[PDB]
Amino acid sequence: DVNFFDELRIGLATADDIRNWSYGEVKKPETINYRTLKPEKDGLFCEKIFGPTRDWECYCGKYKRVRFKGIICERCGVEVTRAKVRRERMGHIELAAPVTHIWYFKGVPSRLGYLLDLAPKDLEKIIYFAAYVITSVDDEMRHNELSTLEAEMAVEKKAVEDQRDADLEARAQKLEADLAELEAEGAKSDVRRKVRDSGEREMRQLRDRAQRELDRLDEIWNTFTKLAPKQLIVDEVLYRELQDRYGEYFTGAMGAESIKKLIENFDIDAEAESLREVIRSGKGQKKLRALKRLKVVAAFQQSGNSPMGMVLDAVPVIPPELRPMVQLDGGRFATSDLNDLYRRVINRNNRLKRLIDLGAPEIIVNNEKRMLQESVDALFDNGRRGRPVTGPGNRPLKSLSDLLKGKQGRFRQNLLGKRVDYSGRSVIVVGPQLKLHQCGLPKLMALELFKPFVMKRLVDLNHAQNIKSAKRMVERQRPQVWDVLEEVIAEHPVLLNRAPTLHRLGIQAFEPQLVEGKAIQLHPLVCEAFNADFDGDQMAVHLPLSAEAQAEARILMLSSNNILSPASGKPLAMPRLDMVTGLYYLTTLVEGATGEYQAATKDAPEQGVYSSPAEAIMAMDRGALSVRAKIKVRLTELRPPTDLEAQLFENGWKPGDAWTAETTLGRVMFNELLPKSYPFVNEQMHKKVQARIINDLAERFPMIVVAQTVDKLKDAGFYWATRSGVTVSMADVLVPPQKQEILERHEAEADAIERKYQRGALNHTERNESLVKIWQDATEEVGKALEEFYPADNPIITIVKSGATTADSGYLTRRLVDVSQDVIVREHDCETERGINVTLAERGPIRDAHVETSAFARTLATDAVDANGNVIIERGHDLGDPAIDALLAAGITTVKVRSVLTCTSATGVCAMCYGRSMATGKLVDIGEAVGIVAAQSIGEPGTQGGLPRVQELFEARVPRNKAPIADVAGRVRLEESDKFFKITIVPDDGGEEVVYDKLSKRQRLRVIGVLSDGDHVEVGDQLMEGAADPHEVLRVQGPREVQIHLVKEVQEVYRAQGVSIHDKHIEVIVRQMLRRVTIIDFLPGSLTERAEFAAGRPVLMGITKASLATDSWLSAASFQETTRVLTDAAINCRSDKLNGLKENVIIGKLIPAGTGISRYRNIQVQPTEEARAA
Ligand SMILES: [Zn+2]
Ligand SMILES: [Zn+2]
């Protein structure tokens, strides 16, 4: 209970370790008495072994008081201690015969098979009593008596030969005399042939019968002469022969005990040195099988674990409370399957003792041992071999393997989650009147949620004197407690979350406000992040308790601090669907509106101007001014545009100054919502515009400003969405009757052309092309009507013009997370000069469309200067959007920017290489777990040329349809075989021509225009449109290029669906694929870390393979291939440093990211001496 450890080591549990764990051997397969329902002595649940059922009470009760702690009762053998030990103490079962641990024997690849060099099929026949095996052979005695045995054996083989030849002549003698005697008597020719045919077969059968024994004897002599330990005999009559004669030279057995003997007479070191020598002689299958086999042999040599652990002499029994036997409510009983699996083991084990003691033919005994062997396999991993053990209803029993994994739908649930106190949920309803940092909380829910809190305040203010009175006071919902609730709730944040949780914005903090009703009121702007429809969705509420937790909610997870998508940097809390149309209408400009500005001439002065913005309101309330009119007024509090601001002042400003411009009264009221410092906009507030303006604000103003500014756009957006006058009815939804009639000629002409196609006037391609012209004619016709058909001021069009309008992908996101979770910023700067080139909106006489996801939010590796001229931007600059335009003037077409691919940080990555945090808009903060955020940023749209191609890339699999890349630079010769293509590259060396043999015409050539014969080609160009083998480009272009390629492919898929993911997210995932280099040979094994590293090569491997290769063994176990990881980890005897965050989550430690880093969890908070005086 120290809560802070360092390592976690695993190793094969020996028979002694098991005996040391156990608190007593369970001897009987008895659960509990059928009458008293008390635990039966010496059986499962035995209180003597595992512990008491009641705290400080022995079984008989002689010592039933709270005293006598840790004293064993001399009548029932029960220790006097808390009943909790009934969940910590184990038992054991002493096996009358050894047994194999199914994990090391059957788990692929066979650990025992590779350890003793026995094929798995052969090994299976040994442990399950299908064939004998030679344990020991005495050479010297055999060699000395070899002569006599040979002589005696020859005599025997001859005696058979003398008999065989002597028998055949007798039958032939009879037939010779018999057939002739029958021939003497009148008989048909066929009769003689039948007898002779029978006689010939009779002889044939007789010689072959003697030949059989000759081959048998020969096999006996050969098998004896070449007898050697580890040999296997399946005949069982041959073996019987070897025992009756020559029985003193050799020894053989079956089952686990023979396997145990071979391990006893086994020299790892002796063997370990032979196989090390064996690797050099024959390269191929022999050395390969030796290479694989040595890994296990070396693991046993380096570690102190005895390979004897693979065969158990004792079996551990899990505590009872984890396999509990419980009396169900309603009279029935329920119990774990382990008890029936343990029952099989102990039942058969005891019967064996019986059989052994009685003395029984080996068949009966061996049959019992095999049964015992199988019962332990079922106990550990049921069904792993043969038909699984089934109970009633033919359902397989839950083995230990199943319950550790979760093989019966338990693992998923463990990472499906664990439940938590101080929580609740309910259906959500819209909260249009809430501030962004607030949420509506049903009073009842907030009551039960804060129950403990309001209880203390209810007692302190002496409404009730004792705590018991406070509990009943809240339980009965006394009217006095509602005043104490607002006091405990004040400035106490809560966490809202809606499943499924895709990105980190799926959980946010809010200021709880007590509300009437049983529904949660959610702010309307956060619907985007939660993907929360109001069709009846429910949301969960959690209550942060500790100071650190509350602070994390106020600072890290607060609603108004998280506005920008942590994937694209785009704003999410930006208005949508209602406020868009409302703001669109407010700012729109209508010609000839009431009060329209008119520059009156020669009879009166202009009538469109107005004294101040307030006056226009009085003209709008009266019928004088339409908010959407083109009037002009003089504003004294808004800031003028940039271009017009220079002409007017250029030296001072207009906090109290005035100025005139012509805009809609609405466009005025709109700009009032923005900050005072922001320049006037004066535009129809299109959907796209609001994104621009909101983006700009995030860069120029703090968060609180944008939060309050978006709050003001919500109110205005809604208010004018109601006065918008947008409703559906018969007229608007009506589809034009003329469109249906015009298509009749459209459909008759497309069909009339089909009647001419059959006649022979079709011309076979123009006809098909002409039909498209007909079909295209209707498309043109609908456009000819569409805007003219429905009045420009149509509410359906206005909604369009304004812009207002599963687990398979989450399966991929899980592998993404598990491969990148340990990637966190660990230092501000690694100081590396390396970087990568960005195209930066090239091809101009023109900005690249993908600059926002490749160049935005980066940092320069080298200064950017435009020659001839001054340096445009200094290295290490943030490369904001304003910087791009400044860079655009210089005419630059490439930029070097730092990246996590080139970062040299020993641990994790550095801030400067990572760059700007998408959520904060500033430099990324040390400790940010950019890996998890990256996996989410990629996984979320996964549910949204699709997921198979993306999964094909991240898993590093050979492309579905392979496409060749250029192996060397030079010109290209193109040839066309029948149904094939040949592509020869004539190098500029010019050396050996590179020929790409056979290429399906179905997978046509790539494009520059389309490639032709004789074009120049570089060292990495893709020759045909398709997916190039990532392992191919790796060996060709090197690690730095494979990353550039993969990112280009992944981002192209997401770009195809209109998803904006910044490259750095994808890069974080790719970086983890090239971290290891294969050695396998100057070193023992391949795939050591690049930093860990006698020549090795750069390696490309999938996320699933890369994540399973992590140094933590319990992280790889909770991920995939559970049984496999433990077996290899137990053998190697690995120790986990508990460095990654997954591990700490399991044991309950602080994750080494965010508020858990060393630098951040050791802050000392003391008040300055200067402040205390006050
Ligand atoms: Zn007792
Ligand atoms: Zn770096």
mmCIF file with all atom_site columns, C-alpha atoms in Angstrom, residues 6 15 73 77 166 188 308 332 337 394 529 576 813 878 895 902 1041 1120:
data_model
loop_
_atom_site.group_PDB
_atom_site.id
_atom_site.type_symbol
_atom_site.label_atom_id
_atom_site.label_alt_id
_atom_site.label_comp_id
_atom_site.label_asym_id
_atom_site.label_entity_id
_atom_site.label_seq_id
_atom_site.pdbx_PDB_ins_code
_atom_site.Cartn_x
_atom_site.Cartn_y
_atom_site.Cartn_z
_atom_site.occupancy
_atom_site.B_iso_or_equiv
_atom_site.pdbx_formal_charge
_atom_site.auth_seq_id
_atom_site.auth_comp_id
_atom_site.auth_asym_id
_atom_site.auth_atom_id
_atom_site.pdbx_PDB_model_num
ATOM 1  C CA . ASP A 1 6    ? 9.462   1.243   -9.672  1.00 0.00 ? 6    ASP A CA 1
ATOM 2  C CA . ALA A 1 15   ? 6.495   -25.700 -8.054  1.00 0.00 ? 15   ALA A CA 1
ATOM 3  C CA . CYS A 1 73   ? -8.255  -21.816 16.647  1.00 0.00 ? 73   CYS A CA 1
ATOM 4  C CA . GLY A 1 77   ? -7.843  -24.374 12.360  1.00 0.00 ? 77   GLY A CA 1
ATOM 5  C CA . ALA A 1 166  ? 10.400  -74.827 -45.669 1.00 0.00 ? 166  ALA A CA 1
ATOM 6  C CA . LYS A 1 188  ? -12.030 -79.039 -66.951 1.00 0.00 ? 188  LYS A CA 1
ATOM 7  C CA . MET A 1 308  ? 11.414  -27.002 -15.218 1.00 0.00 ? 308  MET A CA 1
ATOM 8  C CA . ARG A 1 332  ? -31.300 -20.041 -6.165  1.00 0.00 ? 332  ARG A CA 1
ATOM 9  C CA . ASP A 1 337  ? -17.078 -21.909 -13.558 1.00 0.00 ? 337  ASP A CA 1
ATOM 10 C CA . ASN A 1 394  ? -23.633 -26.617 -24.165 1.00 0.00 ? 394  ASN A CA 1
ATOM 11 C CA . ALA A 1 529  ? -17.948 19.278  -30.337 1.00 0.00 ? 529  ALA A CA 1
ATOM 12 C CA . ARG A 1 576  ? -24.230 27.395  -36.933 1.00 0.00 ? 576  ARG A CA 1
ATOM 13 C CA . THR A 1 813  ? -8.442  4.530   -33.500 1.00 0.00 ? 813  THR A CA 1
ATOM 14 C CA . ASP A 1 878  ? 5.573   30.675  -35.694 1.00 0.00 ? 878  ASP A CA 1
ATOM 15 C CA . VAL A 1 895  ? 10.120  26.504  -46.998 1.00 0.00 ? 895  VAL A CA 1
ATOM 16 C CA . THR A 1 902  ? 13.317  15.152  -37.895 1.00 0.00 ? 902  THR A CA 1
ATOM 17 C CA . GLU A 1 1041 ? 11.192  9.911   -47.730 1.00 0.00 ? 1041 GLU A CA 1
ATOM 18 C CA . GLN A 1 1120 ? -3.473  -7.620  -28.215 1.00 0.00 ? 1120 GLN A CA 1
#
